[PDB]
């Protein structure tokens, strides 16, 4: 049902968690993970993962990870006049930063409204205070996290959603839905399902979770820019992405075979995609003894802004594809992925 | 003989991520001279040569199998391809060059290039997207330079592609053979990494997997002799004291320099502008002192690299003496803190 | 058969003849012309032509010429370090010059492998010698010709070819095939059939051959840039060219009438073509009392490089068109071309 999918998306995209401060998103995931998994574990930096044990003898470790954080800003100084100067957390196009609603998140638990009024460090951020003292008197300090404020809404044709943070609440929902869907099932792999911390700042959580859990194979779950509207590639509604290239990662032949095989058998709509940015796979695949990877993905328009536009159908295709992928991963198939 | 051996390796096609054909070559050449042939998660191949010596330290010796090339980013409606670069290309050398496009179904299709790399037309002589696709061609396909190894007029030098780093690949092959009979004071790991051209990627994984105490990269670097820079074709193997990614530690330097004099090795000092597998490897585990047993060559990362055979011989003798002299005493000295 | 054509094309394009140095191609044309021709003559600069005598009473002389030279380089100096600086022979886009194989052709007959390592005079040409002395010991001198080194190969679909010097071994082969196919037949014109010297350095041979043989009508046979791939006109496989204009030559109305009439009666596939460069016709038509001309043409992608891409099919359309033209050129038709 589309009405339900939207509600689920509205919930996850309206949660507020900037890199290094993803407790609200973790709390959400813990509550959705626990009932469908044997064990809930955590890495040093705050990443949560459900372990789903396998009855299979040589069950290979498979890690599936999205990321919990979203792009945002962080207070670097409080001016004497009460305004804030910020540092970007995650990559922002300065063209989109001016005149935007945000929520400043205080250490003592305040949620104070803040707007931006072209270098980021010079952009005025404004909470309507009369001076430094008053701002400070509301619990505000240098280091406080500033999250975009944007509700999720259906587009006129009801096929698409406009919201913030589809990157990467898509992957948060995708991970949640996966746990629900595989609950009854018994897999041929030892499944580690969850979400990374601190991806937006340089794939930081993917270093630590991949190391901690020693997976043989890794599937990132993450969305990327759709350039269809800009004459570039990645077209909304054309399905899940086969990410063969990005500056940090090359899709290996063995993995490519398995992706295309699985997509063909489960009747999945997919499109080839040449990434220009990096996903968690970029860091993960270099960890331990080496971990073949990809990113099970959706594209979306205007990533890293308040107004990301994306297709609901793309999610369904991506979900089914992630389901089929993990179901089919076992001793035989990872050995084949890693046939050297 | 040395030429044919170089002709063979240099003409093999293996772009980063797609090095099975070079793995197949190393497998066949490593297996008979080694106790065990192992593989990392990403596809690096290494022979293990067991040592009798008690407390024998682990030594990793690695070149890399991948060369520079391009990858299909899209097929245009008109049947041409736009590409992304796999490994660093100077855009001045890319136009009007032959390539082999490698299909997943096993086709080898002739492709030429016709300024930003993404704007350069890659052409296979197809009428439209459909025809290109009917030949098995898909976004993601590997595109490898098409250039053969030949002798220069004086028969002392070779012109080819991929001497970076089929040098190191051959270097690792000749090492296994030379050490076949021998027994060493070190637990030898001997082979070649994957995906070096795209950021020393495999060097992370192989070094983490095999937990060596000492690491010897085997790679070639630019020669500037002809442009007035440093690095002179024919002046022997490289003493790489510096690059942006890695500093040659005093312990290792003493061991490099000492060995070189003992074995009568011709060598030149060499400050590097680019990285080697050592840059990544030395930072793995608890830390692993490293260098690169190197040769310089003119016009690296092109279809037309030019290099001296003599330099190979020099670096080979140097590699041999180095791993022979590596034992508990000498790696403890190297790590004398 | 398409396989026999490739052989003939591989042959012509692999010969080595930069401007001023076309003995190798001239040796080829002598061997192919003599059996099918009454007489073989030469101009003061090195151009060769077969003379096919006519029985027709007031038979007009008709000159058909390709050119034997290709673009390459010439040693300007030998540096003390053994490398060479060069001067261009023919126009090169400097973008295609770096990292290319060549054969340096010595006066004493050595063929020495040379590669290039942005102004052309600044580009390092490398023979892999130790010093100026060693280079000179191999007979290398300032002036030695440096010829592109590139073999001829079929494209995947076997309809097209990748090689060097299709400009203008196209026309060399076109002139050869003309001789063979017309051997035995008898024409209403005194046919002069052959190839010019030094076209690439300024249509220099076309000056001297035309003056010497005094034709009434001139047919250049030369290939030109396909622009299709860049959104320009001239499309591979679309046929033989109707060169109505170029900076050095205007197609005269009488000649145009003859061209279109002939093509259309002989079922020739053709495409209109506005040239941006010159061909032998530009020099030839201004010689003696005036000599109406065109260029019986074909386009090819990436001219003046090691990697030119062209259709065998186009050659066949050009060849059929050339035959039809020369067979139909006689006193009535050249008089009509010259109807003033
Ligand atoms: Zn992301
Ligand atoms: Zn992002
Ligand atoms: Zn290298
Ligand atoms: Zn390299
Ligand atoms: Zn021409
Ligand atoms: Zn020309």
């Amino acid at each position: 049902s589309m009405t339900t999918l939207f509600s689920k998306i509205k919930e996850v995209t309206e949660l507020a968690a900037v890199s290094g401060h993803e407790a609200p998103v973790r709390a959400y995931l813990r509550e959705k993970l626990t009932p469908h998994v044997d064990e809930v574990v955590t890495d040093g930096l705050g990443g949560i993962f459900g372990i789903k044990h396998s009855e299979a003898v040589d069950a290979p470790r498979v890690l599936v990870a999205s990321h919990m954080d979203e792009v945002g800003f962080m207070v670097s100084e409080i001016k004497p006049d009460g305004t804030f100067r910020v540092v970007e957390i995650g990559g922002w196009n300065p063209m989109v930063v001016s005149s935007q609603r945000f929520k400043l998140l205080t250490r003592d638990g305040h949620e104070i409204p803040v707007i931006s009024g072209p270098a980021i460090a010079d952009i005025v951020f404004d909470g309507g205070f009369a001076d430094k003292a008053e701002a400070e008197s509301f619990g505000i300090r240098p280091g406080d996290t500033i999250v975009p404020d944007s509700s999720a809404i259906l587009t006129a044709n009801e096929k698409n959603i406009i919201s913030k943070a589809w990157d990467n609440r898509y992957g948060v929902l995708m991970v949640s839905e996966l746990a629900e869907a595989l609950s009854g099932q018994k897999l041929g792999n030892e499944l580690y399902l969850g979400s990374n911390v601190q991806e937006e700042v340089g794939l930081r959580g993917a270093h630590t979770s991949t190391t901690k859990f020693d997976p043989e194979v890794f599937l990132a779950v993450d969305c990327s820019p759709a350039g269809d509207v800009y004459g570039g590639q990645g077209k909304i509604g054309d399905g899940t992405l086969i990410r063969f290239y990005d500056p940090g990662h090359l899709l290996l032949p063995g993995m490519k075979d398995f992706l295309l095989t699985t997509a063909e058998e489960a009747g999945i709509k997919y499109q080839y995609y040449c990434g220009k940015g990096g996903t968690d796979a970029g860091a993960a695949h270099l960890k331990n003894g080496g971990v073949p990877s990809t990113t099970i993905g959706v594209c979306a328009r205007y990533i890293h802004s308040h107004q990301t536009l994306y297709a609901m159908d793309d999610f369904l295709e991506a979900q089914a594809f992630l389901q089929a992928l993990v179901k089919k991963l076992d001793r035989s198939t990872v050995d084949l992925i890693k046939h050297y």
Side-chain angles (χ1 to χ4, degrees), chain A:
Chain A
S1 153
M2 298 289 177
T3 31
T4 268
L5 214 214
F6 170 71
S7 271
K8 294 189 168 175
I9 290 165
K10 182 175 165 72
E11 202 197 354
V12 291
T13 59
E14 286 170 356
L15 285 178
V18 148
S19 308
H21 306 256
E22 47 287 280
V25 181
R26 174 168 57 251
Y28 166 87
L29 270 180
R30 163 164 268 123
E31 196 246 53
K32 301 232 108 90
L33 249 25
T34 304
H36 317 289
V37 153
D38 309 306
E39 200 181 341
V40 164
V41 298
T42 219
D43 81 2
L45 265 16
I48 24 77
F49 299 88
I51 304 179
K52 209 193 189 284
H53 302 293
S54 179
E55 282 175 12
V57 186
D58 202 352
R61 283 177 170 198
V62 173
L63 167 59
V64 173
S66 57
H67 74 271
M68 300 183 286
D69 58 321
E70 64 190 291
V71 293
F73 304 97
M74 177 181 273
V75 192
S76 58
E77 73 181 292
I78 305 172
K79 286 284 175 206
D81 71 355
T83 58
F84 316 100
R85 290 311 111 95
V86 300
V87 83
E88 78 171 23
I89 286 144
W92 283 86
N93 185 340
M95 285 310 302
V96 309
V97 177
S98 306
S99 298
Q100 298 281 357
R101 260 222 226 345
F102 297 96
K103 276 175 197 144
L104 191 150
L105 267 41
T106 274
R107 194 176 69 102
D108 82 17
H110 276 241
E111 282 185 40
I112 85 103
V114 157
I115 54 163
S116 49
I120 296 158
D122 302 314
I123 294 174
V124 172
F125 275 67
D126 196 350
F129 300 106
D131 57 36
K132 188 151 100 75
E134 187 177 35
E136 284 168 356
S137 83
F138 274 77
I140 306 168
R141 295 291 183 280
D144 282 349
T145 144
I146 297 164
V147 194
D149 180 29
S150 180
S151 72
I153 59 160
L154 231 47
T155 67
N157 76 352
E158 298 192 323
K159 294 312 204 320
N160 306 288
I161 294 172
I162 289 161
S163 79
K164 96 214 214 304
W166 193 226
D167 169 32
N168 189 205
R169 303 296 154 76
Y170 147 80
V172 184
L173 223 208
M174 188 112 312
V175 148
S176 162
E177 289 295 301
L178 219 221
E180 230 156 283
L182 264 32
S183 208
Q185 319 267 156
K186 48 187 74 191
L187 311 151
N189 72 82
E190 185 82 25
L191 176 62
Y192 284 68
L193 214 190
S195 201
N196 280 328
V197 67
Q198 283 191 238
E199 182 284 337
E200 292 299 351
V201 285
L203 318 174
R204 317 232 252 251
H207 282 269
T208 55
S209 59
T210 314
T211 309
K212 208 202 164 101
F213 303 132
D214 201 19
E216 285 191 50
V217 144
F218 170 75
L219 273 28
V221 179
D222 216 335
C223 103
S224 298
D228 59 2
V229 81
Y230 291 121
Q233 72 176 81
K235 181 177 157 58
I236 254 47
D238 277 4
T240 187
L241 315 175
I242 314 297
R243 176 181 289 249
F244 60 86
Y245 176 87
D246 75 57
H249 183 263
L250 307 171
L251 173 60
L252 298 183
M255 191 66 85
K256 198 195 291 198
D257 285 329
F258 182 75
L259 284 172
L260 295 171
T261 276
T262 310
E264 233 66 42
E265 294 170 338
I268 303 299
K269 180 163 69 199
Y270 65 90
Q271 51 178 313
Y272 282 98
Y273 186 84
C274 191
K276 293 142 119 72
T279 76
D280 274 338
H285 83 301
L286 301 181
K287 302 278 92 185
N288 319 112
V291 185
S293 304
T294 4
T295 308
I296 300 325
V298 135
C299 67
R301 303 185 175 155
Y302 335 122
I303 249 73
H304 286 199
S305 86
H306 294 239
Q307 307 306 135
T308 302
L309 196 150
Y310 50 97
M312 283 191 292
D313 221 78
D314 281 350
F315 179 99
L316 298 191
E317 296 290 339
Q319 179 54 204
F321 189 40
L322 221 212
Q323 282 181 20
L325 284 169
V326 308
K327 279 160 97 189
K328 234 182 269 262
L329 286 157
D330 54 26
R331 176 47 61 208
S332 326
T333 57
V334 327
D335 270 12
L336 213 222
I337 290 169
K338 299 174 62 183
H339 179 50
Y340 304 129

